[PDB]
Design a protein around this ligand. Structure first.
Ligand SMILES: *[C@@H]1O[C@H](CO)[C@@H](O[C@@H]2O[C@H](CO)[C@@H](O[C@@H]3O[C@H](CO[C@H]4O[C@H](CO[C@H]5O[C@H](CO)[C@@H](O)[C@H](O)[C@@H]5O[C@H]5O[C@H](CO)[C@@H](O)[C@H](O)[C@@H]5O)[C@@H](O)[C@H](O[C@H]5O[C@H](CO)[C@@H](O)[C@H](O)[C@@H]5O)[C@@H]4O)[C@@H](O)[C@H](O[C@H]4O[C@H](CO)[C@@H](O)[C@H](O)[C@@H]4O[C@H]4O[C@H](CO)[C@@H](O)[C@H](O)[C@@H]4O[C@H]4O[C@H](CO)[C@@H](O)[C@H](O)[C@@H]4O)[C@@H]3O)[C@H](O)[C@H]2NC(C)=O)[C@H](O)[C@H]1NC(C)=O
Ligand SMILES: *[C@@H]1O[C@H](CO)[C@@H](O[C@@H]2O[C@H](CO)[C@@H](O[C@@H]3O[C@H](CO)[C@@H](O)[C@H](O)[C@@H]3O)[C@H](O)[C@H]2NC(C)=O)[C@H](O)[C@H]1NC(C)=O
Ligand SMILES: *[C@@H]1O[C@H](CO)[C@@H](O[C@@H]2O[C@H](CO)[C@@H](O)[C@H](O)[C@H]2NC(C)=O)[C@H](O)[C@H]1NC(C)=O
Lengths: 333, 104, 108
């Protein structure tokens, strides 16, 4: 009817290459979000997937009409004919909009030129997780976006009061982590092209201790007590205790190769590989101790007699101590 | 691609600040020692074309390899040597040790 | 295979030791291989409980053998008694546990 006339009059003499107020003042853009789901945070690639509903609203004095209808509600058929800010996410490895069934976009042009432009995005954002204290580690890693070609003098972003609003936080694929909060931030960065207004949203993730607690910690402590079981077998049966020791070492190295295969190749010492190293040391020390025991039986029997019973008490106490220290320290650290 | 060296000329802007952000790059396994900016020309069957080159010199970290695959070898060889202290009468223990170390 | 180590005589310590260690490490590798198929989840599944109970059983068998070996040459009566009792105590307990697990998890 008459809405066609309005839409035709808005695009008569319209240049979608010039931002609103091209030579007057910067264009103020208010950005809001709606985090559907924060996908799996895989530490191997130092990345994490997020799915949002990015909404941008600005003022365009050229899309200003005067009729009885207050707001024009449109699909993605008129997005490519008006000016649209070139917001890009500065820390996204790969991100893409949705196109099924129709491009997921929305355009609402109010009466006074205020434009709202909303789209659906799935961003594989990047954040270098400092994999210390693993798996007792907490991260807070961001999602940054800014204009691409327009510096601070032309496009200025600004958060709304109630900008970022998470969803249910229950049907998310955050398996090993747990959402605890978020916070928005605005700064200005320097680039070879100019000064840009960079907005950021920091999501706080806290690694829950469950998968690793049952995959490596329990197996390794039970392997340690299996190695302690050798301290009660009689000292004359050599091939039995040597088999205990060597098979324990084999399982220990396999389990370490697995725990380390969990997280990526890092040249520093985490808190989990430290644990498996201490357990390895325990097993190796029980083996070398029984070695010197059997060797000293030929030299001095009373030494070995006082040594089996010395180790039976010395090993579990040292292991309790180690555990206590480690755990308490990391929980306080 | 299309334009030979008498149609286009490539050069770095600044010649040493043309490439930035290298010192901030952290790699989980390597370490950027330095980087070089080279300007030259290539000659193909169709003409002589301009060319720039940005070359990185990565050096691989060694901590992971020591802790992961050098130490187990040394401990297995020492576990093989311990068999020298065992008396020659126990044939099921020294064999056990040696065979297991070989397998490992 | 772990429970067979009870019917062996008390003089063959090498054998029972191999039984115990190998079974404990087969249970370890089975737990690891069973946990890899699922997502990296932070609670315990039913299969996790079954594997935990079987792991506990192999660590109760090994412990019984260790106790028998500790009481051998000092109180061989007690050792033999406990061995003979565990030859009936382990299979019935495992059967009861399987009837409980399967009944309470298949009714749902
Ligand atoms: C190197 O080579 C590469 C390979 O060629 C090349 O990649 C190609 O790049 C071009 C340009 O960037 C891409 O073409 C554009 O694609 C945009 C969207 O792309 C998404 O979708 C395509 C699939 O496209 C189908 O689906 C969309 C959405 O429904 C349709 O709009 C398309 O027409 C097309 O639909 C046909 O096919 C469907 C089956 O798929 C059928 O169901 C359907 O019925 C149709 O038959 C995907 O392939 C894309 O994935 C790729 O790109 C992403 C980008 O992130 C990558 O991540 C990913 O990995 C893939 O590589 C992506 O998912 C189109 O929107 C766009 O068309 C608009 O723009 C042009 C130019 O401005 C207009 O002329 C055109 O008319 C469209 O504008 C109209 O529609 C929009 C809708 O949003 C309106 O907003 C707009 O106002 C305008 O409306 C007006 O006109 C309408 C008529 O057109 C009219 O109806 C309206 O009323 C109004 O008047 C364009 O097609 C191409 O997809 C890439 N291909 C590949 C394989 O990647 C690369 O760039 C090259 N590199 C360099 C450096 O050169
Ligand atoms: C990595 O390998 C590349 C490939 O060879 C190396 O590029 C070479 O760099 C040297 C010095 O940077 C170049 O030598 C120069 O030759 C010109 C010739 O006019 C001369 O004027 C200079 O004084 C210098 O001798 C060499 O041409 C160049 N090779 C190619 C094929 O471009 C690079 O140096 C190596 N190192 C790094 C860190 O990338
Ligand atoms: C998101 O951004 C908004 C605006 O930058 C923050 O809202 C401000 O909050 C402070 C402290 O609560 C108030 O003093 C300001 O008046 C607020 N400004 C506006 C425009 O609302 C908000 O706190 C941010 N969200 C966070 C940090 O979680």
């Amino acid at each position: 009817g008459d809405v066609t006339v309005i839409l035709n009059n808005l695009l008569e003499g319209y240049d979608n290459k010039l931002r609103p107020d091209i030579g007057v003042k910067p264009t103020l853009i208010h950005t809001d979000m709606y985090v559907n789901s924060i996908g799996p945070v895989n530490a191997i690639n130092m990345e994490y997937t997020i799915d949002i509903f990015f909404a941008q609203t600005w003022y365009d004095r050229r899309l200003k009409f005067n009729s009885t209808i207050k707001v024009l509600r449109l699909n993605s058929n008129m997005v490519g004919k008006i000016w649209i800010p070139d917001t890009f996410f500065r820390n996204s490895k790969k991100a893409d909009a949705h196109w099924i069934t129709t491009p997921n976009r929305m355009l609402r042009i109010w009466n006074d030129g205020r434009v709202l432009y909303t789209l659906r995005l799935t961003i594989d954002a990047e954040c270098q997780l400092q994999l210390h204290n693993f798996p007792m580690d907490e991260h807070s890693c961001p999602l940054e976006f800014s204009s691409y070609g327009y510096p601070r003098e032309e496009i200025v972003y600004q958060w709304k009061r109630s900008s970022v609003e998470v969803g249910d936080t229950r049907s998310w694929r955050l398996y090993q982590f747990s959402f605890v909060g978020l916070r928005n931030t605005t700064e200005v960065v320097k680039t070879t092209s100019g000064d840009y207004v960079v907005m950021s949203v920091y999501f706080d993730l806290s690694r829950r201790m469950g998968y690793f607690t049952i995959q490596t910690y329990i197996p390794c402590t039970l392997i340690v007590v299996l190695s302690w079981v050798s301290f009660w077998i009689n000292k004359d049966a050599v091939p039995a205790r040597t088999s205990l020791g060597i098979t324990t070492v084999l399982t220990m190295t396999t389990l370490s190769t697995i725990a380390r295969k969990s997280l990526p190749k890092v040249s520093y010492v985490t808190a989990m590989d430290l644990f498996v190293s201490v357990c390895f040391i325990f097993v190796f020390s029980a083996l070398v101790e029984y070695g010197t025991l059997h060797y000293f039986v030929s030299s001095q029997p009373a030494r070995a007699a006082k040594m089996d019973s010395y180790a039976r008490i010395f090993f579990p106490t040292a292991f309790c101590l180690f555990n206590l220290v480690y755990w308490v320290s990391y929980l306080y650290l | 691609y299309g334009y030979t060296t008498d149609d286009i000329e490539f050069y770095w802007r600044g010649d040493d600040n043309a490439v930035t952000g290298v010192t901030k790059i952290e790699l989980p396994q390597f370490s950027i020692v330095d980087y070089k900016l080279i300007t030259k020309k290539v000659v193909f069957s169709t003409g002589s074309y301009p060319r720039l080159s940005l070359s990185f010199k990565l050096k691989r970290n060694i901590g992971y390899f020591i802790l992961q695959t050098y130490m187990p070898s040394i401990l297995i060889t020492i576990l093989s040597w311990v068999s020298f202290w065992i008396n020659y009468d126990a044939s099921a223990a020294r064999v056990a040790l040696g065979i297991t170390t070989v397998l490992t | 295979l772990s429970q067979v180590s009870f019917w062996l005589n008390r003089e063959s310590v090498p054998a029972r030791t191999v039984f115990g260690v190998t079974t404990v490490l087969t249970m370890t590798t089975l737990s690891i291989s069973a946990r890899n198929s699922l997502p990296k989840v932070a609670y315990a599944t039913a299969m996790d409980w079954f594997i935990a109970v079987c792991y506990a059983f192999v660590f109760s068998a090994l412990i019984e053998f260790a106790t028998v070996n500790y009481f051998t040459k000092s109180q061989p009566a007690r050792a033999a008694k406990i061995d003979r009792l565990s030859r009936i105590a382990f299979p019935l307990l495992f059967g009861i546990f399987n009837l409980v697990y399967w009944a309470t998890y298949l009714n749902r």
